[PDB]
Design an enzyme around this catalytic site. Structure first.
Site, PDB file in Angstrom:
ATOM      1  N   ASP B   6       0.835  -1.190   0.000  1.00 16.72           N
ATOM      2  CA  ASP B   6       0.000   0.000   0.000  1.00 16.72           C
ATOM      3  C   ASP B   6       0.877   1.249   0.000  1.00 16.72           C
ATOM      4  O   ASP B   6       2.044   1.190   0.392  1.00 16.72           O
ATOM      5  CB  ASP B   6      -0.860   0.013   1.262  1.00 16.72           C
ATOM      6  CG  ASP B   6      -1.841   1.149   1.422  1.00 16.72           C
ATOM      7  OD1 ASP B   6      -2.246   1.753   0.423  1.00 16.72           O
ATOM      8  OD2 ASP B   6      -2.191   1.416   2.567  1.00 16.72           O
ATOM      9  N   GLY B   8      -0.584   4.793   0.828  1.00 13.33           N
ATOM     10  CA  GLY B   8      -1.077   5.666   1.880  1.00 13.33           C
ATOM     11  C   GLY B   8      -0.981   5.029   3.262  1.00 13.33           C
ATOM     12  O   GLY B   8      -1.664   4.011   3.540  1.00 13.33           O
ATOM     13  N   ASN B 108      -5.210   2.580  -4.257  1.00 14.70           N
ATOM     14  CA  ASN B 108      -6.423   3.279  -4.627  1.00 14.70           C
ATOM     15  C   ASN B 108      -6.138   4.772  -4.654  1.00 14.70           C
ATOM     16  O   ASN B 108      -5.824   5.355  -3.617  1.00 14.70           O
ATOM     17  CB  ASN B 108      -7.520   3.055  -3.594  1.00 14.70           C
ATOM     18  CG  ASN B 108      -8.014   1.630  -3.516  1.00 14.70           C
ATOM     19  OD1 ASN B 108      -7.695   0.792  -4.361  1.00 14.70           O
ATOM     20  ND2 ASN B 108      -8.912   1.388  -2.577  1.00 14.70           N
ATOM     21  N   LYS B 141      -8.888  -1.756  -4.147  1.00 12.46           N
ATOM     22  CA  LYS B 141      -8.941  -2.548  -2.915  1.00 12.46           C
ATOM     23  C   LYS B 141     -10.213  -2.185  -2.153  1.00 12.46           C
ATOM     24  O   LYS B 141     -10.658  -1.043  -2.257  1.00 12.46           O
ATOM     25  CB  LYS B 141      -7.720  -2.283  -2.025  1.00 12.46           C
ATOM     26  CG  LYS B 141      -6.395  -2.579  -2.710  1.00 12.46           C
ATOM     27  CD  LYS B 141      -5.209  -2.121  -1.901  1.00 12.46           C
ATOM     28  CE  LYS B 141      -5.159  -0.615  -1.724  1.00 12.46           C
ATOM     29  NZ  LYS B 141      -3.888  -0.222  -1.080  1.00 12.46           N
ATOM     30  N   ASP B 166      -2.630  -0.702   5.855  1.00 11.90           N
ATOM     31  CA  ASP B 166      -3.071  -0.260   7.166  1.00 11.90           C
ATOM     32  C   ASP B 166      -4.582  -0.381   7.272  1.00 11.90           C
ATOM     33  O   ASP B 166      -5.129  -0.086   8.322  1.00 11.90           O
ATOM     34  CB  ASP B 166      -2.638   1.189   7.441  1.00 11.90           C
ATOM     35  CG  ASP B 166      -3.101   2.169   6.379  1.00 11.90           C
ATOM     36  OD1 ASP B 166      -2.712   1.989   5.216  1.00 11.90           O
ATOM     37  OD2 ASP B 166      -3.858   3.080   6.726  1.00 11.90           O
TER      38      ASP B 166
HETATM   39 CL   LIG Z   1      -5.004   2.653  -1.158  1.00 13.09          CL
HETATM   40 CL   LIG Z   2      -2.839   4.623  -1.348  1.00 13.41          CL
HETATM   41 MG   LIG Z   3      -3.277   2.789   3.459  1.00 11.17          MG
END
Ligand SMILES: [Cl-]
Ligand SMILES: [Cl-]
Ligand SMILES: [Mg+2]
Ligand SMILES: [Ca+2]
Ligand SMILES: [Ca+2]
Ligand SMILES: [Cl-]
Ligand SMILES: [Cl-]
Ligand SMILES: [Cl-]
Ligand SMILES: [Cl-]
Ligand SMILES: [Cl-]
Ligand SMILES: [Cl-]
Ligand SMILES: [Mg+2]
Lengths: 199, 199
Positions: B6, B8, B108, B141, B166
């Site tokens: 991921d 973020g 995303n 996702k 996360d």
């Molecule tokens: Cl994401």
């Molecule tokens: Cl992300």
């Molecule tokens: Mg994240």
């Protein structure tokens, strides 16, 4: 005591390479060309002092760097500048105040009327008794007149004043007036200085 | 092994409160109103999957939040989002590759055509074998199809794949397919996981 803090690279980390990245993203101009052509001369000094408009400042940098941007596009990338708070410094500032010390910020600013800038951040405003900005004053560090404006407006003598800045010329400009000036070498300078004196 | 990260709050810290601050700065709408009205529903999912345009996405959020912004103004504030690299994670990613592991990013994204976004950062591109983005795939996702796209395109089985995110739903979506999924609790999860295994 009167405590004067610089903003850039003292209270916040700030990185204008993010801006160059954003202008590169839009223009497709190789980042390395922008890094080479991007330098802080007269148009910066004037803009800092509010002597030329945001548009004129944009026009000057775009001319220097061969940036085919509208003002809006300039601003859009300018907005991208990397800014992170240093919470250690913010907490120290709050602490100094509640112990009845006076705490202010002194910043040469190239904020535009269209951008959201650190001096506008609630966390920085709420941490300071006052924020002194170059554009409002028509003065910039390291000119003696800006330090004097602050001593005069706050009612403190040089000898009762401590100033933190990472720029050595700024530090010299303050020293000339008998201000106690602390060069900020990195993120430890200020936490150290205040370690024993607070906790 | 195949490592999926991921973006973020895993490779970068990211904070959209900066954006709300910037829109507050321009509109004068109290920050607290924007914080209350700002929530990630259907218009987000669609934009993430490239199903509606940047403009339509802007229009939907501005309608929700009563933001009297042009698209350009929306974008201008969107550009302000706080993003800091986690250099520990970037270094780990580089290390995994030079040991012949495959390293990719799965994100995303609500990048706009007018903004400079983390997936466009040279340091993040240069750290990954590949970057998989929701808008390009028409998937997001935690949908099974996006994890499957990655296994299929990279040529790895679930059991040879490790995924870091996360978001707990994202982690669940991966687990359903037999991916080894590591919930990122904070900035130590990933340095720990790789402590002994690298150095
Ligand atoms: Cl994401
Ligand atoms: Cl992300
Ligand atoms: Mg994240
Ligand atoms: Ca502003
Ligand atoms: Ca872009
Ligand atoms: Cl500053
Ligand atoms: Cl290109
Ligand atoms: Cl300054
Ligand atoms: Cl002077
Ligand atoms: Cl107002
Ligand atoms: Cl699916
Ligand atoms: Mg500075």
């Amino acid at each position: 005591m009167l405590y004067i803090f610089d903003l850039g690279n003292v209270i916040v980390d700030i990185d204008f390479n993010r801006v160059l990245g954003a202008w590169s993203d839009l223009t497709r101009i190789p980042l390395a060309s922008l890094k080479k052509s991007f330098h802080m001369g007269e148009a910066f000094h004037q803009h800092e002092r509010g002597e030329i408009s945001d548009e004129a400042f944009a026009e000057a940098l775009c001319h220097e760097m061969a940036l085919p941007l509208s003002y809006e596009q300039f601003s859009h990338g300018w907005q991208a500048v990397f800014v992170a708070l240093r919470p250690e410094v913010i907490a120290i500032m709050h602490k100094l105040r509640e112990q009845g010390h006076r705490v202010v910020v002194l910043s040469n600013t190239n904020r535009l009327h269209t951008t959201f800038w650190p001096e506008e951040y609630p966390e920085i405003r709420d941490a300071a008794d006052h924020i002194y900005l170059s554009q409002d004053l028509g003065m910039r560090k390291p000119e003696a007149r800006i330090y004097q404006h602050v001593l005069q407006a706050e009612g403190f003598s040089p000898s009762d004043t401590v100033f933190f800045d990472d720029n050595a010329d700024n530090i010299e400009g303050a020293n000339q007036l008998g201000i106690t000036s602390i060069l900020v070498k990195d993120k430890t300078t200020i936490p150290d200085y205040f370690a024993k004196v607070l906790c």
